[PDB]
Amino acid sequence: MNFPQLSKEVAEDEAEVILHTSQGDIRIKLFPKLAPLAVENFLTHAKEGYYNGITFHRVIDGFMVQTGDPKGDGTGGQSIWHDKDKTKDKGTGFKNEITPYLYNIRGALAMANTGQPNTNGSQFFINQNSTDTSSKLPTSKYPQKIIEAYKEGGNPSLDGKHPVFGQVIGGMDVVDKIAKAEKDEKDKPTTAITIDSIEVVKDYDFKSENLYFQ
Ligand SMILES: [Cl-]
Ligand SMILES: [Cl-]
């Protein structure tokens, strides 16, 4: 099996963005063929300026950093289909796109949501854990190459609950710097860490029917 998170190369069927944050650049490749709703929602919000000035409002070293909330407290954000297309957003967000090809390994980009179905809106997080807990993973559920990948860290308890849609391929040192920022009792950084802009290096057209040789 091919696990697209295990290569830093951007495949022909992948997209690429750079989060230009006040702490540095995070280069991320996206998986529109595996998580089409999460990637379309993210790319459209990015190009529409929805994340310009948005903060990393909650950081936990050894766990993850989360962002994408216009309210800055983890209670806000909407999908691009909210009050536009009920076949995609019934009112609280879009559905989880879980696939056996994407996991919450270190560097994985996933949607936050409330833990209930159809609650993916605009909030997302980057897995930042760097501890090896791979010996506890059931070999009947985790492919051997993914168990190997988890040795570098990740949050496997998030698999199946949080849809993965991207992978950091550059600037993980910036993600670690953000995760260790000085913060208050609610884990909100003392000095705001902002997404100043998102550069779409390689976009993806959801109406494209091009076939790519694998
Ligand atoms: Cl990896
Ligand atoms: Cl769902």
Author numbering: 60 to 273
Which lines from the publication concern this structure?
For the remaining eight chains, the electron density maps had insufficient quality to model the C-terminal residue. Both structures also contain extra secondary structural elements adjacent to the β-barrel composed of residues 189–212 (η2, 193–195; η3, 203–211; η4, 215–217). To gain further insights into these novel structured appendages/insertions, we utilized AlphaFold3 (46) to model our solved SpnSlrA protein structure and a known tetrapeptide substrate (amino acids AAPF) of the human cyclophilin A. The predicted interaction revealed a model where the appendages interact with the AAPF substrate in a dynamic fashion, suggesting that these appendages may aid in substrate recognition or activity. Using affinity isothermal titration calorimetry (ITC), we determined that SpnSlrA and SpyPpiA bind to CsA with a dissociation constants (Kd) of 122.4 ± 41.4 nM and 365.7 ± 102.1 nM, respectively.
Here, we solved the protein structures of two secreted parvulin and two secreted cyclophilin-like peptidyl-prolyl isomerase (PPIase) ATP-independent chaperones found in gram-positive streptococcal species. Two types of ATP-independent extracellular PPIases exist in pathogenic streptococci: the parvulin and cyclophilin families. Unlike cytoplasmic PPIases, extracellular PPIases have canonical secretion signal peptides that allow for their translocation across the cell membrane via the Sec pathway. These chaperones are lipidated to the outer leaflet of the membrane and function in the space between the bacterial membrane and cell wall.
